[PDB]
Amino acid sequence: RRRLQRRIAGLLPPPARRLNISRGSEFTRDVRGLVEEHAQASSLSAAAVWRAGLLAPGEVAVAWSGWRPPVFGDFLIHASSFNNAEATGTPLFQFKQSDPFSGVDAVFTPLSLFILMNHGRGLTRMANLLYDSPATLADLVPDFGRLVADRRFHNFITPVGPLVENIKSTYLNKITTVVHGPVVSKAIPRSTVKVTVPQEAFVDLDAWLSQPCPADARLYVALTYEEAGPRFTFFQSSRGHCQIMNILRIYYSPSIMHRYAVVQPLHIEELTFGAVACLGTFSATDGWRRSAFNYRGSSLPVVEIDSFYSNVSDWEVIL
Amino acid sequence: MDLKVVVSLLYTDEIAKMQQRIGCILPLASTHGTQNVQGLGLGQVYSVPDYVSMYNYLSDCTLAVLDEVSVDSLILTKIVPGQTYAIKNKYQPFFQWHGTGSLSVMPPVFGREHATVKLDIVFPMVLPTPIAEEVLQKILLFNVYSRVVMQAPGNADMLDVHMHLGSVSYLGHHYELALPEVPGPLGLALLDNLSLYFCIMVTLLPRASMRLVRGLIRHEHHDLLNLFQEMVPDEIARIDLDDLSVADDLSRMRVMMTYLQSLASLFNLGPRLATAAYSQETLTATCWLR
Amino acid sequence: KIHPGVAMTVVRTDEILSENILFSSRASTSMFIGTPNVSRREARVDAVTF
Amino acid sequence: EYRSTVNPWASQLGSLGDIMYNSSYRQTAVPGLYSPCRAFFNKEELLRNNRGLYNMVNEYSQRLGGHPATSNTEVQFVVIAGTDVFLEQPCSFLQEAF
Numbered sequence: 189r190r191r192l193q194r195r196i197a198g199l200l201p202p203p204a205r206r207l208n209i210s211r212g213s214e215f216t217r218d219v220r221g222l223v224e225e226h227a228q229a230s231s232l233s234a235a236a237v238w239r240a241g242l243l244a245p246g247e248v249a250v251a252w253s254g255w256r257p258p259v260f261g262d263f264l265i266h267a268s269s270f271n272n273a274e275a276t277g278t279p280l281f282q283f284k285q286s287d288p289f290s291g292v293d294a295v296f297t298p299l300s301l302f303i304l305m306n307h308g309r310g311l312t313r314m315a316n317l318l319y320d321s322p323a324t325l326a327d328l329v330p331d332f333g334r335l336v337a338d339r340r341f342h343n344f345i346t347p348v349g350p351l352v353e354n355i356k357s358t359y360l361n362k363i364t365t366v367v368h369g370p371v372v373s374k375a376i377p378r379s380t381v382k383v384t385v386p387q388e389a390f391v392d393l394d395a396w397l398s399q400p401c402p403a404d405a406r407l408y409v410a411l412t413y414e415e416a417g418p419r420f421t422f423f424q425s426s427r428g429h430c431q432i433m434n435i436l437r438i439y440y441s442p443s444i445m446h447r448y449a450v451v452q453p454l455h456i457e458e459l460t461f462g463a464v465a466c467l468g469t470f471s472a473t474d475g476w477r478r479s480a481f482n483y484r485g486s487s488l489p490v491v492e493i494d495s496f497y498s499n500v501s502d503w504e505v506i507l
Numbered sequence: 508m509d510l511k512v513v514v515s516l517l518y519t520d521e522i523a524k525m526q527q528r529i530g531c532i533l534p535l536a537s538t539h540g541t542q543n544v545q546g547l548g549l550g551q552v553y554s555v556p557d558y559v560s561m562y563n564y565l566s567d568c569t570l571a572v573l574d575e576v577s578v579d580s581l582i583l584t585k586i587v588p589g590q591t592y593a594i595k596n597k598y599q600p601f602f603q604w605h606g607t608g609s610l611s612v613m614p615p616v617f618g619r620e621h622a623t624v625k626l627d628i629v630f631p632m633v634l635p636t637p638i639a640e641e642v643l644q645k646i647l648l649f650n651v652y653s654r655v656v657m658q659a660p661g662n663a664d665m666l667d668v669h670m671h672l673g674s675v676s677y678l679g680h681h682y683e684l685a686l687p688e689v690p691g692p693l694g695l696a697l698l699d700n701l702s703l704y705f706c707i708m709v710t711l712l713p714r715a716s717m718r719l720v721r722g723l724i725r726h727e728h729h730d731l732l733n734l735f736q737e738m739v740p741d742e743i744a745r746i747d748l749d750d751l752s753v754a755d756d757l758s759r760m761r762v763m764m765t766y767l768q769s770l771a772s773l774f775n776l777g778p779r780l781a782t783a784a785y786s787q788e789t790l791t792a793t794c795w796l797r
Numbered sequence: 798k799i800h801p802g803v804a805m806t807v808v809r810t811d812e813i814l815s816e817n818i819l820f821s822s823r824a825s826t827s828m829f830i831g832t833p834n835v836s837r838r839e840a841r842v843d844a845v846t847f
Numbered sequence: 848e849y850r851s852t853v854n855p856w857a858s859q860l861g862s863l864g865d866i867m868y869n870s871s872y873r874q875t876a877v878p879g880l881y882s883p884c885r886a887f888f889n890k891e892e893l894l895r896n897n898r899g900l901y902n903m904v905n906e907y908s909q910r911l912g913g914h915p916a917t918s919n920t921e922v923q924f925v926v927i928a929g930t931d932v933f934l935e936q937p938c939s940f941l942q943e944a945f
Contacts, residue, residue, distance in 0.1 A: 232833035242837055242847070246590065252508070257840040259591055259793060261607055261783040266874050266927075282607055288679045292927070293606060327875045343637060348607050358910060359874070359929025367607060367783050368795065376834055445735065453739070500781070501797075502609065502636070510842060574843070584842060591841045783839075793841060803856075808884040808944065812918055 203253045226250070229378060258369030261348060264292045265361050269328055270300065271318045272356045273483055276373065277383040277492070279409070279467060280348050280365050283329060292360065294328040295348070298389060298420055304332065309417045311388045314488045336418060338455075342411050342463045342503050349467065349498035350383045371496045383407075383496040384481065387489035390422040392476070393435065402426055405472035407493060410436065412462035412506070414443060415450045423464075424493075426472055429504070436464060436506055463503035470496045510584045512571060514542045517578060517626070524624050525576040530595020530791065532612070533630045534568045538585055549614065549629035556697040559704075559773060561614035565631060566777050570612070570796075591783070591795040594633070598622055602634040603680055604792060610780040611639040616646055616697060617685050638677050639776045645672050646686070650702040653690055701773070704766050711763035713744050718756065721749065864888065872914060874927060881916045881925040886939050889914070896942070903940070913939035 204222040226248035230240035237243065241250040247257070263282070274297055281301060283294045296304065302315040307322035319325060326332065335341050350371050353364045364374070373381045394405075405426035412419050425432055444461055453459050470493055481490040512535065517525070533548030545551060552564050572594050573583035586592055596604050599621045604610070612631045615622045622630050634642075652668040675682050690696035694703075723733050737745075783793040839846040857864020869888045886892065892913050896903055906912075915934055917924045926932055938944065 229834055229836040232835055237835060242835060246840060246842065246845075257590065257837070259783045259795070260838050261793075263606070268874060284605065284678055286679050288603065290605075321871070323871065324873060324875060327873065327877060330877060346607055346609070357929070359926065368781065374836060374838065441732070444732075448735075459739075502779070591839070593841050593843050793839065806854075808887070810883040810916055810923070810938075812916075 225253070225255070227378075229374070229376060256369050258366050258372060260352065260364050260374075261367045263295050263348070263363050263365065265295050265363065266292065266328075267357065267359050267361050268324045269294065270297070270354075270361055270363070272354060272361075273318065274299070274351065274354070275384045275481060275490075276352065276354075277350055277371070277381045277496070279350050279383060279385065280363075281345050282348050283345050285328070286330060295363065295365075296325075296328075296345075297351075298386065298422075300325060301420055302389075304329065305417045305419065308333075311386055311488055314483060314486055317483060317485060336413070338457045339413055339460045340457070341413075341418065342460075342505075345411070347409055347465055347467055347500050349500055350381070350496060352381065366498050367500060368498060371498050380495065382477075382479075382492040382494040384479070384490050384492050385422045386481075387478070387491055389420060390424075390491050393423045393425040393439070396439070397435075401472060403472055404469040404497075405475060406432075406469045407467045407496070408432055408436075408464050409467050410462060410464045410506070412440065412443065413447070413460070415447050418462070424476055429466065432464065433504065433506070440506060459507075461506045463505045465503050466499060466501040468497050468499035470494070508587075510587065512538075512542065512583050512585055513540065514544075514547065514581050514583065516544060516580060517576075521624075521626065522576060522578070525581070525628075528597050528624070528630065529573060529576065530593075530597050531630050532570050532572045532586070532594055532633065533628065534565055535571050535583075535585060536568060538569060544626075547628050549631060550627055553614065553619070553629050554627075555695065556619075558614060558616065558698050558701055559769070562773055562777055565612060565614055570778060586796050588796040591793055593791050594794050595790050596633065596792075597790065598630070598632060598634075600632065600634075600682075600685075602638055602682065603787070604635060604782065604785045605678070606782070606785050608635040608782055608785070609797075610634070610782055610792075610794060611636050611776040612778050612780065613639060613643075613776060616642070618687075621685070633780075635677070636776060636779070638675055640774070641675050641677070642684070643774070643776075645675060645684070646698055647702055647705060648672060649686055650690065650696070650698050651706065653688075654692065654702070657692055701770070704770050708763055708767050708770060711759055713747055714751070714756065714759060715763055716740070717745070717747055717749065718760070865890075874925070879925055879927070881923045883916070883923075886914045887942065887944070892939075893942075896940075907940055908935065912936060915939075 204218075207219055207222050209216065209219055226241055228242070228248070230236050230242070239250065241248050244251070247253060247255070263280075278297050278299075281296045281298070283296060285292075285294050299315050300319050302312065303319050303322050303325060306312055306315065307326065329335070335344070348365050349367050351363060351365050352371070352373055353375075355362055371381055371383065373379055405424060408423040408425060410421050410423060412421065423432070423436070425435075427435065440461065447461070451458070474494060476491050476493055479490055479492045480487050535548070536542060536546030549561065549564075552561050569585055571583045571585040572592055573581055575582040584592075596602070600617045610633055612633055615629065615632050617632060619629070622632055624630070649668065649672045652663050652672070655662050656665060656668075669686075673684050673686055675684065687696060690699070694700070720733060720737065779797050780794050781797045783795075785792040835847055837845060837847060852858035854864075856862055859865070864884075865888055868882060868885055869890055871891060872885060872889050895913065898906070911926065911929070911933075912935070915926045915932070915936060917926055917928075917932065918934075
């Protein structure tokens with residue numbers, strides 16, 4: 189019953205919430221013990237692993253903290269269906285193939301997903317520069333035109349979130365994407381990763397309206413059905429999902445009667461005007477710093493959502 | 508934190524039957540340390556079968572995978588929305604899972620005898636979301652089409668509703684179903700009340716939509732779309748009544764709004780569980796609460 | 798079994814399960830070995846994956 | 848040097864031996880079967896060897912050169928795994944047949 193006292197001693201101490209520091213230049217051990225968050229990658233020695241403490245159950249502790257470990261979904265795609273000059277921080281989209289036993293999936297980055305839309309009818313210059321032939325991508329979906337024609341394209345693509353690591357294989361490329369959690373790279377210098385989305389495809393919804401500012405302003409994807417070929421736009425907002433559907437209806441108010449005027453809805457399935465999905469949250473203050481993205485020839489403008497927290501949801505239809 | 512739950516109670520064939528499903532999930536009664544038999548999954552609700560109460564009970568309590576079965580205990584861990592788990596597709600209606608597909612939990616519509624263990628313990632079905640909503644639609648239209656041919660044989664045919672309702676389809680997977688071909692009228696079947704909600708809301712939708720358009724169009728222009736989409740309905744549903752007792756009309760409107768919201772919260776499948784990387788060779792999948 | 802108006806050149810291929818001989822000279826490449834590094838990549842509640 | 852072709856139904860540009868075989872070789876083709884004469888007919892493969900000899904052989908051994916065929920299966924499929932298969936082929940180098 190005295191061993192229970194040692195057990196409650198090993199179980200008590202929470203992470204340090206307050207710390208009465210005195211001066212800054214002293215750098216006490218207690219404030220170091222507050223600010224030291226354990227690592228994830230270390231050299232391979234049993235003493236080095238013990239100081240890194242990776243053997244601790246669930247969360248890391250040297251023989252809970254409001255922090256979540258990220259999961260890493262793995263995918264396999266053909267080498268021509270992807271360009272190895274893609275950025276690290278770019279969101280990806282899985283298209284479910286129609287074979288029952290598949291093994292090799294089919295993932296589309298928005299640059300690649302653009303040329304599934306343009307062929308059949310700046311940014312499109314780069315999308316044709318990187319993925320040169322649409323025919324190498326027009327076949328990963330077997331029946332694209334029929335699936336657009338009955339407007340069930342959105343429930344076949346589930347977003348998988350941003351990319352992390354691309355081991356540039358020869359034929360069957362293996363990519364790792366974070367479906368959930370803190371988006372952080374698996375590198376030996378563990379460098380920060382910023383999710384990028386191309387600028388012309390990404391319209392802000394905050395300054396589109398031109399006092400309550402929260403910390404987590406979410407990022408929304410939206411596939412929309414146009415008679416001029418469907419479009420993938422992205423959305424930054426600091427609102428609730430209840431607000432995001434109404435303000436997206438008001439934002440798409442020209443395009444709905446555009447499609448209504450050009451194509452009359454003859455059947456009953458064309459009335460779905462696309463859907464939305466929360467891709468996750470990030471910091472509302474330091475959001476969406478612009479940057480540039482060079483291939484060997486050209487440069488498209490591109491946003492950089494920095495320190496992103498990925499969280500996929502399902503599809504909620506715009507109407 | 509601490510996640511284990513040790514519940515107290517079996518024999519050798521019970522050991523084998525519970526050992527068959529050591530990767531499946533089932534709900535609990537409370538998030539405590541020790542519990543009894545009665546607090547386990549779907550026992551006190553499913554023994555008259557009724558779907559909407561069981562979906563409410565499944566969204567009510569928490570969920571738990573089980574880990575090990577002893578002679579007198581079942582070691583099981585409840586799931587928390589913090590961290591991730593590893594569960595299995597070890598259900599006798601075998602729906603093949605896929606990568607980054609969201610998994611659902613619906614109460615068992617595939618008969619008692621498939622997803623059960625006779626000691627009682629009733630496990631819920633786990634299956635992905637498009638298969639979930641499609642099997643919901645294809646069991647609901649099966650219900651109303653069975654009730655119609657039990658009422659009127661000249662409105663539909665039995666093989667007419669088995670060429671298109673006995674099978675679900677998802678990425679080439681053309682499964683079959685165990686449809687209850689003899690439901691029996693006056694309720695008394697599973698999904699007897701959900702069709703009875705669906706018909707009432709689809710009956711009160713004209714009285715709702717016309718009253719809403721006539722009440723919204725007098726506020727002259729917040730938007731053009733309420734009159735822009737006046738052409739897309741048929742004119743048969745346009746000129747219906749425009750006059751009723753507003754006591755009766757208000758009561759009908761309140762009941763249709765309540766039943767609509769309950770039905771729309773049920774058509775959302777419930778506790779959505781998200782996968783990350785499924786492995787069919789191991790029959791396991793990374794999963795976490797959403 | 799009469800000849801038609803056209804002739805055909807069949808084309809096949811063949812698989813030779815050889816047993817090759819990699820021969821290299823001494824001190825060709827100058828490889829650089831790095832320190833091994835362990836890393837946690839998925840942390841569930843039943844068994845962590847290193 | 849006394850005859851241009853020895854057969855005029857395949858050596859021509861829009862000939863029978865080209866237009867039923869020389870589609871662009873894709874790994875993501877839904878049929879995906881292995882057609883063994885596609886090394887002798889793919890014009891893009893016929894102009895990948897436009898480079899001189901040294902960078903031809905280094906690009907021949909630095910990867911799987913062009914159009915390999917699978918082993919260990921019943922009917923010969925085109926190569927789609929690529930992780931555990933490894934083979935060199937001179938008929939994707941010197942463009943002849945025995």
